[PDB]
Amino acid sequence: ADVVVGIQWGDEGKGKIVDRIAKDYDFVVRYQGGHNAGHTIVHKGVKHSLHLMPSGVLYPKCKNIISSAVVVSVKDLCEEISAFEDLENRLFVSDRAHVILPYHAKKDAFKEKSQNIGTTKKGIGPCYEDKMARSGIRMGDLLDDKILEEKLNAHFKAIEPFKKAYDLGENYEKDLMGYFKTYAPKICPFIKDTTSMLIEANQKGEKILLEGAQGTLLDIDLGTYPFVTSSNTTSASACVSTGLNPKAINEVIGITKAYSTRVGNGPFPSEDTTPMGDHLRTKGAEFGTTTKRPRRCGWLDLVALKYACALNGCTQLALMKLDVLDGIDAIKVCVAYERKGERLEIFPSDLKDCVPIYQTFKGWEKSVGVRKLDDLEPNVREYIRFIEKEVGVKIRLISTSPEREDTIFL
Amino acid sequence: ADVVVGIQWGDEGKGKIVDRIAKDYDFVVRYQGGHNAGHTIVHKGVKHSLHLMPSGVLYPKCKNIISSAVVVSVKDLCEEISAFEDLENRLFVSDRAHVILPYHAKKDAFKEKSQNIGTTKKGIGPCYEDKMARSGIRMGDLLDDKILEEKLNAHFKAIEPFKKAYDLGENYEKDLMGYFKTYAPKICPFIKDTTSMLIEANQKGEKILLEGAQGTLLDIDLGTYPFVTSSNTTSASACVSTGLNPKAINEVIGITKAYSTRVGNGPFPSEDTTPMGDHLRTKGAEFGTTTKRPRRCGWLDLVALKYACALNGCTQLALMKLDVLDGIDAIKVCVAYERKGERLEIFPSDLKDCVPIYQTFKGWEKSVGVRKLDDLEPNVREYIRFIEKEVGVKIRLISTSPEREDTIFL
Numbered sequence: 001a002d003v004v005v006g007i008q009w010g011d012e013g014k015g016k017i018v019d020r021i022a023k024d025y026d027f028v029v030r031y032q033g034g035h036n037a038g039h040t041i042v043h044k045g046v047k048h049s050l051h052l053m054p055s056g057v058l059y060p061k062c063k064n065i066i067s068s069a070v071v072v073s074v075k076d077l078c079e080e081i082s083a084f085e086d087l088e089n090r091l092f093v094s095d096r097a098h099v100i101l102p103y104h105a106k107k108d109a110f111k112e113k114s115q116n117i118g119t120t121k122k123g124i125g126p127c128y129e130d131k132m133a134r135s136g137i138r139m140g141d142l143l144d145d146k147i148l149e150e151k152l153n154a155h156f157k158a159i160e161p162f163k164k165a166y167d168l169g170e171n172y173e174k175d176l177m178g179y180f181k182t183y184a185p186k187i188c189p190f191i192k193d194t195t196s197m198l199i200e201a202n203q204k205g206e207k208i209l210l211e212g213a214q215g216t217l218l219d220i221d222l223g224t225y226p227f228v229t230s231s232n233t234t235s236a237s238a239c240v241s242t243g244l245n246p247k248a249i250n251e252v253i254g255i256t257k258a259y260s261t262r263v264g265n266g267p268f269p270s271e272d273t274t275p276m277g278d279h280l281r282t283k284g285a286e287f288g289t290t291t292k293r294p295r296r297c298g299w300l301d302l303v304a305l306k307y308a309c310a311l312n313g314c315t316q317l318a319l320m321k322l323d324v325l326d327g328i329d330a331i332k333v334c335v336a337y338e339r340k341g342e343r344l345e346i347f348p349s350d351l352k353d354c355v356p357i358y359q360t361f362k363g364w365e366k367s368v369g370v371r372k373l374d375d376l377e378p379n380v381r382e383y384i385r386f387i388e389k390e391v392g393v394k395i396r397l398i399s400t401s402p403e404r405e406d407t408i409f410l
Numbered sequence: 411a412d413v414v415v416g417i418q419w420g421d422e423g424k425g426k427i428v429d430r431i432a433k434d435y436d437f438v439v440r441y442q443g444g445h446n447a448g449h450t451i452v453h454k455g456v457k458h459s460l461h462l463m464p465s466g467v468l469y470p471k472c473k474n475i476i477s478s479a480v481v482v483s484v485k486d487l488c489e490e491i492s493a494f495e496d497l498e499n500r501l502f503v504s505d506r507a508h509v510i511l512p513y514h515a516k517k518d519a520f521k522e523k524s525q526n527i528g529t530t531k532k533g534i535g536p537c538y539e540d541k542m543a544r545s546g547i548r549m550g551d552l553l554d555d556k557i558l559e560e561k562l563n564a565h566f567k568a569i570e571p572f573k574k575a576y577d578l579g580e581n582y583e584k585d586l587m588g589y590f591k592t593y594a595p596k597i598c599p600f601i602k603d604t605t606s607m608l609i610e611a612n613q614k615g616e617k618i619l620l621e622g623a624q625g626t627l628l629d630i631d632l633g634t635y636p637f638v639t640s641s642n643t644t645s646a647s648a649c650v651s652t653g654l655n656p657k658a659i660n661e662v663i664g665i666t667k668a669y670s671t672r673v674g675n676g677p678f679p680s681e682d683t684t685p686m687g688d689h690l691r692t693k694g695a696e697f698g699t700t701t702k703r704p705r706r707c708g709w710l711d712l713v714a715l716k717y718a719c720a721l722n723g724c725t726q727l728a729l730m731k732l733d734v735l736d737g738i739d740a741i742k743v744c745v746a747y748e749r750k751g752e753r754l755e756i757f758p759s760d761l762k763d764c765v766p767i768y769q770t771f772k773g774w775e776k777s778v779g780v781r782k783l784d785d786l787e788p789n790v791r792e793y794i795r796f797i798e799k800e801v802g803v804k805i806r807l808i809s810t811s812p813e814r815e816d817t818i819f820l
């Protein structure tokens with residue numbers, strides 16, 4: 001199995017890369033996160049913004065799997081399903097995936113008033129909380145009405161003291177029963193034991209592609225806590241809960257932009273808050289695929305990149321959005337941190353007082369839409385060479401526009 | 411890096427195996443769980459029951475690491491530290507590990523009144539809940555008094571509505587400040603960036619052994635939910651949050667008993683509730699290393715074992731407690747499940763109505779203390795051969811008593 005992982009703070013271009021390479025796989029698997037994710041595919045002038053639907057959906061011969069460590073908003077997934085034809089037998093949702101309830105999004109919004117993490121307000125964190133509490137509802141529960149009713153009854157009891165605090169509707173209980181009466185029949189045909197499916201697929205030598213969501217620096221354990229998502233986002237997360245094991249991982253494709261973004265609060269050493277950062281936002285159209293929030297923009301940070309590469313075991317890199325830098329006279333790359341007169345070459349566990357140390361590169365003019373290495377300007381290829389040398393991983397895919405085919409393969 | 415994982419429901423003999431093989435490693439790493447774990451080492455008539463302390467502690471040249479996905483009761487860890495000499499520079503606790511507060515154990519006990527999971531009542535689940543909420547305190551916070559005070563102040567506000575419900579002391583707030591004034595100075599010298607330590611150790615080719623806690627069937631995602639622990643327990647969990655990556659995993663040693671146990675509630679297809687199960691409990695001294703609860707006992711279940719082997723990628727097996735079966739005339743092994751007239755060869759996602767189908771093996775008389783394959787009775791070796799054939803993984807370690815040296819290496 002191969003894994004596509006974002007090695008920054010999300011939105012690196014994972015949807016584009018997965019869609020570009022998915023034709024050569026039998027399964028494409030979303031393995032963590034929820035509909036906080038937003039993965040944009042563009043082909044022939046048509047854009048799809050996927051949230052939980054895996055990015056193999058444009059190849060009908062692929063089997064798309066939503067695996068057990070995902071958190072599922074059933075209504076939102078059904079709305080994604082309605083955008084494609086004949087998804088029966090090419091989309092499967094794990095019976096072990098946990099279910100996001102409206103309470104979760106209301107609780108997310110409420111706690112955000114005081115925590116100020118900048119979550120997507122989709123209820124992801126609270127759903128993972130109920131999973132750890134072992135009180136959460138799983139997709140398999142939707143297959144039996146009596147089991148679902150017992151679990152919903154426990155949920156109604158458990159949340160009663162928070163009805164006013166969380167601004168829960170006075171018809172919350174009747175509305176939620178009606179929610180499942182509406183959406184359970186639509187989603188139930190897709191619910192399967194996907195763990196067994198992937199155990200068997202691995203044993204049979206089928207080609208499996210695992211699609212990460214978020215990025216390494218948003219990992220609950222190893223990212224910029226508490227400014228992180230509530231799931232593990234590294235490549236090993238793809239073999240924790242899918243039915244695969246670490247020995248099955250072959251290629252690990254780390255996705256990185258030629259600059260940096262994050263959306264929401266938290267440390268960002270190479271952030272550019274000057275009008276150049278605003279230029280990156282405008283030219284790169286850096287607005288959240290899910291929330292439409294303006295992203296924070298900055299320069300590529302190789303200290304953080306080396307850390308993420310180590311945690312993932314990247315065997316190749318995909319370098320994205322080189323075209324956004326067209327016309328910028330000087331490109332900065334953070335190669336180290338200064339901290340109180342100390343030069344840090346290694347990503348620390350606390351980013352307080354870490355100031356970027358920049359190396360500057362000569363810019364280029366017209367990488368947009370280029371499809372051959374021969375046609376890239378010398379200064380682009382010099383930038384690429386530097387990144388490869390510093391990180392120690394070959395850049396094998398280069399993206400020069402949102403379009404699927406505007407990609408160089410090496 | 412090599413990984414030792416329990417492939418049943420915990421208590422397979424992981425502490426014994428890790429201690430038996432740890433002399434040949436530079437690092438021994440606990441990577442998940444908390445002091446719910448209880449790992450028993452016996453050597454020369456002296457027993458150590460470890461809970462969070464890694465099982466390389468009896469080899470002073472080893473470096474023992476408590477990694478980031480662990481949950482840490484500081485008082486309990488300090489009490490373990492006091493049992494060994496000169497642990498400075500051979501024990502390191504990740505600055506990213508989360509801290510178990512007394513509130514967590516009180517909340518665990520309270521929710522257990524209605525959930526009846528049968529947790530160890532150590533506060534593990536609630537601590538992982540606060541991690542997903544991104545409100546949890548991490549070990550690195552203990553290194554700065556101002557940061558700890560701000561986080562404790564938020565904790566006091568957050569828990570106030572539960573003071574009566576959870577039977578929190580009226581001096582809870584002053585007691586908890588005093589708790590950290592007592593224990594933070596003792597633990598602070600051990601707190602380090604262990605992620606960077608293991609990134610570097612892996613890059614340098616040092617020998618790393620990862621010690622699992624619990625077992626595969628207790629995995630939060632893929633185990634017998636909700637009768638599971640709140641962490642991931644498979645071998646990939648060892649490369650999610652430690653600083654390693656899946657490509658670094660070499661050997662995966664799956665630890666299994668020659669029969670089965672679980673402690674706490676939940677499905678157990680091969681459970682034996684007759685006096686034979688009571689005999690297994692007495693002869694095997696099957697009482698929880700942590701809680702002293704009597705374990706539920708039963709027969710080896712190869713359907714569940716094949717599932718766990720697939721999730722972990724086991725390259726070798728360690729077969730434990732063969733000596734407990736000495737004198738039993740017929741040994742049963744569950745080779746399949748019957749479910750409503752259907753024969754299941756593959757572990758299903760719901761164990762309801764699954765009845766064990768048994769194959770019977772001729773017993774043996776005196777495997778206890780045997781140290782050479784030549785000295786094992788033919789019927790023992792026939793049993794071993796069958797397990798290896800059915801599971802497809804070679805049994806490389808055979809344990810014939812609690813003692814470190816009562817182990818056969820192949």
Ligand SMILES: Nc1nc2c(ncn2[C@@H]2O[C@H](COP(=O)(O)OP(=O)(O)O)[C@@H](O)[C@H]2O)c(=O)[nH]1
Nearest residue numbers: 011012013014015039040289321399400401402
């Ligand atoms: N200009 C440009 N845009 C790109 C390129 N690759 C992807 N995109 C667009 O960049 C944005 C990436 O954000 P997003 O879809 O959230 O990334 P993901 O979450 O990693 O899939 C989307 O609008 C993509 O269509 C590229 O090479 N150049």
Ligand SMILES: Nc1nc2c(ncn2[C@@H]2O[C@H](COP(=O)(O)OP(=O)(O)O)[C@@H](O)[C@H]2O)c(=O)[nH]1
Nearest residue numbers: 421422423424425449450699731809810811812
């Ligand atoms: N009789 C016998 N006891 C064993 C053997 N291996 C380990 N033990 C004991 O079996 C129990 C294993 O439970 P525990 O320590 O909780 O296992 P762990 O959690 O996997 O380390 C302990 O009392 C060990 O001392 C064996 O081969 N034979």
Ligand SMILES: O=P(O)(O)OC[C@H]1O[C@@H](n2cnc3c(OP(=O)(O)O)ncnc32)[C@H](O)[C@@H]1O
Nearest residue numbers: 010011036037038119120213214228229263264
């Ligand atoms: O509890 P959450 O709702 O998950 O928010 C926690 C933090 O993580 C951010 N976040 C969550 N998903 C993100 C994403 O997804 P993709 O790369 O898959 O498209 N890309 C970028 N940022 C993302 C949020 O802004 C916030 O900072």
Ligand SMILES: O=P(O)(O)OC[C@H]1O[C@@H](n2cnc3c(OP(=O)(O)O)ncnc32)[C@H](O)[C@@H]1O
Nearest residue numbers: 420421446447448529530623624638639673674
């Ligand atoms: O929330 P928790 O306190 O973790 O309880 C959840 C469930 O998991 C059991 N449990 C937890 N740790 C266990 C263990 O550890 P070692 O193998 O590492 O010694 N061995 C066996 N069972 C174990 C508990 O009995 C319960 O069923």
Ligand SMILES: O=CN(O)CC(=O)O
Nearest residue numbers: 037038288289290291
């Ligand atoms: O693509 C998804 N994001 O950028 C998260 C968001 O929209 O906030």
Ligand SMILES: O=CN(O)CC(=O)O
Nearest residue numbers: 447448698699700701
């Ligand atoms: O070794 C630890 N266990 O068996 C868990 C417990 O004691 O309950």
Ligand SMILES: [Mg+2]
Nearest residue numbers: 011038039289
């Ligand atoms: Mg996105």
Ligand SMILES: [Mg+2]
Nearest residue numbers: 421448449699
């Ligand atoms: Mg134990």
